[PDB]
Amino acid sequence: GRRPRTAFTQNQIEVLENVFRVNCYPGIDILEDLAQKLNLELDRIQIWFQNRRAKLKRSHRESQFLM
Secondary structure, eight states: OOOOSOOOOHHHHHHHHHHHTTOSSOOHHHHHHHHHHHTOOHHHHHHHHHHHHHHHHOSOOTTOOOO
């Protein structure tokens, strides 16, 4: 249920980092591959990859303006 910005050991972050170089947004089979390997659930890795993109953007969002 609606989990906060999750964190790990940097020995788990560095696998996700070295993937994120190659695909700044992966597909489900790469999320399941990481899930079965890292012992994480797809939801935690989705929240990781989306907090990654959000951090890299730093301001603004696609479906957003506010003005």
